């Protein structure tokens, strides 16, 4: 496994270079709103799958293990990405550069919307760095479905933990500040997990409503949680 032989700086560089692009929206009622967000989610999903392959250690797993991990964490990964690029837009969610949205604007959603805003506010309060974000995102990918299958994944997770500490040490944080910040970051994943589950349940009702056009891929990823 090449992933464990990588240094900390090389781990960061690998993750940064693997970053998926920022997509645009196809440019508001409740039918058009959902249609746009799901359309965007389906296209981002395709990029996520290609991003997952470039995550150090993910290629070393069997195809079936990769499928399990992605099925378990895809909505979390979408959400933490949405939260990340919404950091510099307080009170707003940047789904796309041409789609910066209000909490004013179709529910289901307001609960999840405010939670996403709250996460974005927490990141901003912590001054979350890009190098720290890509580590958290990869952690979600490997951790979220690891308890539903082991040694390989846990060792890669340990590697990312070392990488996170490496970043904090480089930033000039003290020994106490390092494990405190490490704690603050990983505790946020618990909330992101919560948001995903709430978002998944809402997605099930959208399917049962049979109004919003959902792609077969987005439907298959939705079936995995049912």
């Amino acid at each position: 496994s090449l992933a464990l032989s990588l240094t900390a700086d090389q781990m960061v560089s690998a993750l940064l270079d693997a970053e998926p692009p920022i997509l645009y929206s196809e440019y508001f009622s409740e039918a058009s709103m959902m249609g746009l967000l799901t359309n965007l989610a389906d296209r981002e999903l395709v990029h996520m799958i290609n991003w997952a392959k470039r995550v150090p250690g993910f290629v070393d797993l069997t195809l079936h293990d990769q499928v399990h991990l992605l099925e378990c964490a895809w909505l979390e990964i979408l959400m933490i990405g949405l939260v990340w690029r919404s950091m510099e837009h307080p009170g707003k969610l940047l789904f796309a550069p041409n789609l910066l949205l209000d909490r004013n604007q179709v529910e289901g959603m307001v609960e999840i919307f405010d939670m996403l805003l709250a996460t974005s506010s927490r990141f901003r309060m912590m001054n979350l760095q890009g190098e720290e974000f890509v580590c958290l995102k990869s952690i979600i990918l490997l951790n979220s479905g690891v308890y539903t299958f082991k040694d390989h994944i846990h060792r890669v997770l340990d590697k990312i933990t070392d990488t996170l500490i490496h970043l904090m040490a480089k930033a000039g944080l003290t020994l106490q500040q390092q494990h405190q910040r490490l704690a603050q970051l990983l505790l946020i994943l618990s909330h992101i997990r919560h948001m995903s589950n709430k978002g998944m349940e809402h997605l099930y009702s959208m399917k049962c409503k049979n109004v919003v056009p959902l792609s077969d891929l987005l439907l298959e990823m939705l079936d995995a949680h049912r």
Binding site: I49, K53, V67, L70, L217, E220
Partner: peptide, 10 residues
């Protein structure tokens, strides 16, 4: 047989 399988292999 799923779409996720195909995208992961390409």
């Amino acid at each position: 047989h799923k779409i996720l399988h195909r995208l992961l292999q390409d």
